[model samples]
Target: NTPPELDTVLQAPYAYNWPTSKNVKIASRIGIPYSTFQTIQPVSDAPNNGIGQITFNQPLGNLTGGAPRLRVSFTAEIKNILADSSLKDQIGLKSFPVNRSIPVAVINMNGKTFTSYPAQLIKLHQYNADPLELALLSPCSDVDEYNKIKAVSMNNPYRQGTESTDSRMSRGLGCNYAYYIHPRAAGSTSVKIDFVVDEALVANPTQYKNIKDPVPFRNLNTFKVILDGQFKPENMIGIADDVKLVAGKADFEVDITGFKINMLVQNWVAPLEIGDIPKTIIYNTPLISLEGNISSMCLNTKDPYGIPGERNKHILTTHSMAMNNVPSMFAVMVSQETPTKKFAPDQLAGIIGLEIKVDSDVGIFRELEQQQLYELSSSNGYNKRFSCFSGALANGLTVADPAVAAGNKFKEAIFGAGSVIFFRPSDLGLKDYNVMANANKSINMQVQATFVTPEAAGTGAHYKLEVFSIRDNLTYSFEDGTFMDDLTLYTPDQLLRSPLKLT
Candidate 1:
């Protein structure tokens, strides 16, 4: 009864010409014209090593303590030109082996390379332009400028005339993960990106012929390759009066000022004799963390046309990381305390807590604290009933969405109803809680390490974030382009931790 109401409603697929509408959206993005061909460049062409090695001639930064390696994650989008050229509706249904194989995906760095498989694998998609979106996260490419990406991997099977009747049939191919590469010496960068078809297709550059069901070796061609992942921000930095962060769901975003991060995740990772280690030989890291409490959530709603109404109730935020950006989430932990007690683990000593000062006083903090107090007292003990945290479930959810159907189904592994009991508050160099309860006291904190806040980041401002587990004996890291590799293995709880009931 506290949070605002959401409008969830949507109309089924309409508009018969989603074909051109699809290609047009692509054209507008990278500045390509209608019917204009956009193909991937030959790795052997110019400044490129005739054998698929592409070099970055104009190197930018020096080895001054930062992420010297690159984690390039790539994905490919296939389009049938013979059909789209004239009638876009004529989908070229091709037959592939059960283990469907594709051109090997690889990244060669400074005379080194990493490949996805001996003979890359891929799934056959029956070109359908629509993906279920309540307004969350598109299309073919020119293969030209090479700049396009979409979050969702599932397409709307109910689109006009589109059918996903067979359980074996699929329209979207999955994601490939973060590939590592190193480059830190004193020279321009050299990288070799190879595909099984690069050399074979050099003979048929601009236009390749395709008569499906033809000889496997003769007509095989790779139409496109798309890559996205984290890069060393230290190699570059920025400052701005205002910056927009790509937030998740309904394309929501929050603006901010004076934000920065000293070092990023991958940047700090290295081997001995490789780069400088900022702290003592100790492996523990000091990562910047954002903390907040959840009050209540508004149900997400949507629908097309002139202000029609809500979207299907089942359409959830997690379902669209497929098509939309993952909303940045603030992490939380639960704890209790007693008024009179000495320092102890169970009853002899401590408790856990954190407070983030965003300065804007957006009023969000107050609501969060209120909810935090409410949840703590409402629950029987410390654990809340129902799966309220994971972002994988909704309130009283009855059905699972495609994005999480079997994706993050945390194996039958159980971590138990986390144990937390009646706790007494203790004083840490402060007066007793009984006296503190009646006094308006402020808290002061001092840490052991120094912090560096760079003045400006040249042109582009950093997103200013960037992880760790709150529990001991726990390690956390995010893999860039994961999923289709193994639906549930490296999902929400990738690092393999107890089921976290708080986001």
Candidate 2:
């Protein structure tokens, strides 16, 4: 038998406590990569022509090369051919003819004129009754008289509206006893005569100068159209018993029930050619004015995570972290790196200040689960604990409150408050930047921000960032060599993220 104390100790042997490590590591440095991307955001769903304005705001470097020519494609339809009663009567009951010399129609576009070709009129042979009886009647006699007599005669075998004469005529004489002409006679209804004026036609000042305001041409631009010729009835009258006959010529006006015109314009800094430069320097300067089709807005780069393109990715600095027993501080210092020492003070002379506007949308904090963040970071070779800072509090940034900024549905972060943060190019070693040195050189810069955890500073929630707009301010020196610090090139309303989505 064992002692009572010894038996108790043996029974609790498996419950003995084990020693644990006294120090724990928790702090981490989170590095979120970024990129610079660019894409065209459509201003409107409708095409920009003389009817509407379209403002172009590509980078200056982009436009330095050849300008893009606006392409225009349009279509139109013509119908409804009405014949004068006198001309119809002169052609006689047997047939109506048209002549070649007669002007069927004329179409004028922006003052340019076009004429139409002659058209043949086909006669309906079924309108004539019994062959023997029709042969004895005069050709000029009323053609409907036989039809009226047959309809009332006891020998009539055809039912009303079912006979060939009763069938609706789209392009020939009607069987009505009153001899009323059909609106669709002479091949006017259900026809699609298409015409296209390719890029062959150039928009000229003489033609487009009178166009309503909001034109896109910097100088004399090119616009063209296809015109339909007016018809002449006198030229279309003729006599013939055959199925097809040329109507003799007559001056006729074609009513344009519908029309559509396409206009194209090229935008550029200067004209392709110039003569007598010295004397007419002032006059030679191309005149430019905003037309209704376009609007001036702040131009920005594309969002990093939105899509894949040339301007989609941005460079980041090496990530740094601070550790403690529990999670403390985590941050990644990032900036855009210029490859060729292209952005140094020596290269860029006479530059004093710079301004950059960064428009970004911040994701919700609580909505992001810990597991999702861990998986996303781990896929990129990062630890599960390493995650991007989320929410407005992460970057010491002030974002518009969605509840009151505009509406509850929209939220955004605009980083352009402090002038010094972006104005000092020398601090970032970018004073040497020179855009003229190389046309293909990169002109991108970055701003620094430290994101920390809630234990170290504020809420430790992980947030996803989507940078939409990245615009820089350029300060030009005065003509006298004095730096005009007050002046800066900027557009106030640059659209970064639009609420409207195109399906």
What are the clash counts of all predictions, listed in order? 27, 61
How does residue 115 of candidate 1 score in lDDT?
A: 38
Per-residue alpha-carbon lDDT of model 1 for 1-503, expressed as tens digits? 69999999977776854767546753322311224212233233221111122222211111111111111112111211121122111111111211122233342222222233211111101101111210011111001000001111122211112332321232112111111212223332221111111111101110111211111111111112211111111101111111111233221111211111111111111335435433212111111122221111112232111121222111101110110111111122221122111111111001112222222212222233323432432332323222121111121122233444442322211111111111111212123222121122222221111011111112111111101111111111112211111111222333324454763
TM-score, cand. 2 = 0.16
Q: How close is every model to the real structure, measured as TM-score?
A: 0.18, 0.16
- Candidate 2, residues 301-400, lDDT tens digits: the string is 4321112132112221211111111111111112111211111100000001122211221221224333443343234222212112121121122233
Best by TM-score: 1
Alpha carbon lDDT of each predicted model: 0.19, 0.21
**Which ranges of candidate 1 are over 4 A from the true structure?**
1-33, 43-355, 359-410, 413-503
Each model's Cα RMSD = 27.0, 35.9
**Candidate 1: how large is its RMSD?**
27.0
Q: What does the lDDT read for residue 313 in candidate 2? A: 24
